[PDB]
């Protein structure tokens, strides 16, 4: 069937294609060429996995179509889902709700994962009888398939039971430490054959085993999630709405201290991750200045960046800098350069894309498409793969031929041909 995840621009990439010595294979895990860049990415990946060093920045720079986002997706895939990988674009830090520096702080704190581990004793059973004498004192009877006992209730326990409207036949769990009662379900009897059911009622089997049980919960949360939880009274709602605002720095310092205390106590573990900012040249000079000192914290993730700009103008200034990035930040980061692909590399990438899309192409078609990709662009050839597959299927064919590629080349124009045709009729278009 068709799931929500479909063939995208980087669906064929499963990893960086390296061996145990971080030597890149020519074509492994869906990546072709970029040997030096892939080796550098693997070194950075080992640095991320060790987690010892904080606030390391790497910039993937190169011409468009040279595999920068491909390398970033390969790094994300090779890194486990356990380790956080926050991928944002440069334009996403311009928010109407929070400042640019707040957006960058939240992006930094989303990239550090905290794995928590709480062990809690609970009582779990089906309610048999609740007798309350008069809201002063009462008794509660709970049962399993192998056990049954009666409990003496106090004032607060009676109030909590009356508030939750616990009745007979309900399967509930009670936390011994805090006394909070959550209802799991109700048992099914012959008399409970309802014709209409409430939105929260559900029928479950009576629990087996022993009435007293230990509950172990292990989950991975980020620092930003703890900040949002502790920002306001019902801050967990902002984890859905996103209406977080600007969290106070004192709250962040308290949460860092508390997380360190948990890590010392053994109740939590830190998993530093990666923050990938794609098209960083969109960041303003203020954002770069903030990044300069944000990476210097002991709770800063690895900052991977990718730009395709030459010596251009920094946003918010009139200065020219080699990547659109001020040289002060560029001195804080290692630059990984991507080289343009050759004819063989382009053909191998086209083969991988065809395999991903399940398209059969003749060798002459591959030669023509590789020539087109060298002449126009690699992405144009990749799109022509699917266009030619569709056209071939339209004429009830099974293998894409050169005629199909020529047909889709005539139907769909690249940038150069469109620009030429526009220049031919320049006066027709508006605001030249």
């Amino acid at each position: 069937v068709t799931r929500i995840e479909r063939i995208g621009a980087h669906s064929h990439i499963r990893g960086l294609g390296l061996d145990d010595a971080l030597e890149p294979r020519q074509a492994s895990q869906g990546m072709v060429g970029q040997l030096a860049a892939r080796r550098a990415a693997g070194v950075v990946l080992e640095m991320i996995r060790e987690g010892k060093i904080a606030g390391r920045a790497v910039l993937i720079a190169g011409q468009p179509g040279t595999g920068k986002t491909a390398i970033a997706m390969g790094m994300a895939q090779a890194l486990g889902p356990d380790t956080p990988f926050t991928a944002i674009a440069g334009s996403e830090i311009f928010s109407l709700e929070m400042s640019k520096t707040e957006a960058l702080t939240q992006a930094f704190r989303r990239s550090i994962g905290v794995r928590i581990k709480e062990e809690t004793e609970i009582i779990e059973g089906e309610v048999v009888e609740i007798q309350i004498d008069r809201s002063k004192v009462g008794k509660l009877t709970l049962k399993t398939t192998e056990m049954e006992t009666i409990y003496d209730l106090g004032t607060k326990m009676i109030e909590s039971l009356t508030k939750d409207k616990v009745q007979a036949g309900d399967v509930i769990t009670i936390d011994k430490a805090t006394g909070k009662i959550s209802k799991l379900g109700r048992s099914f009897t012959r008399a409970r054959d309802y014709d209409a059911m409430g939105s929260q009622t559900k029928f479950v089997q009576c629990p087996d085993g022993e009435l007293q049980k230990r509950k172990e919960v292990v989950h991975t949360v980020s620092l930003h999630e703890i900040d949002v939880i502790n920002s306001r009274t019902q801050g967990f709602l902002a984890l859905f709405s996103g209406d977080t605002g600007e969290i106070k720095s004192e709250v962040r310092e308290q949460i860092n201290a508390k997380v360190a205390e948990w890590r010392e106590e053994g109740k939590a573990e830190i998993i530093p991750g990666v923050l990938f900012i794609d098209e960083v040249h969109m960041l303003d000079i203020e954002s770069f200045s903030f990044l300069n000192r944000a990476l210097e914290s002991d709770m800063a993730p690895v900052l991977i960046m990718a730009t395709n700009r030459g010596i251009t103008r920094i946003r918010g200034t009139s200065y020219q800098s080699p990547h659109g990035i001020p040289i002060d930040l560029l001195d804080r980061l290692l630059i990984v350069s991507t080289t343009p692909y050759s004819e063989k590399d382009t053909k191998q990438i086209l083969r991988i894309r065809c395999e991903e899309e399940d398209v059969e192409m003749s060798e002459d078609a591959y030669t023509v498409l590789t020539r087109i990709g060298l002449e126009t662009s690699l992405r144009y050839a990749i799109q022509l793969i699917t266009a030619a597959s569709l056209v071939c299927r339209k004429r009830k064919g099974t293998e894409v031929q050169v005629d199909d590629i020529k047909r889709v080349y005539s139907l769909f124009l690249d940038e150069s041909r469109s620009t030429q045709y526009m220049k031919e009729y320049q006066d027709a278009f508006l605001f030249n």
Partner: protein
């Protein structure tokens, strides 16, 4: 002290968003935010399975 403004509208307007139950699906099967503060990890992971 002034009397309030009495704004009169068509009775059909107040039923514009209303959809009959036989004409709409149950949106509670996608309710993730409603589970917060009410459903625990124990129930979802260990008990119900």
């Amino acid at each position: 002290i002034t009397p309030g403004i009495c704004f009169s509208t068509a009775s059909l307007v107040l039923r514009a968003t209303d959809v009959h139950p036989l004409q709409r699906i149950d949106m509670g099967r996608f309710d993730l935010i409603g589970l917060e503060g009410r459903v625990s990890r124990y129930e979802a992971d260990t008990f119900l399975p």
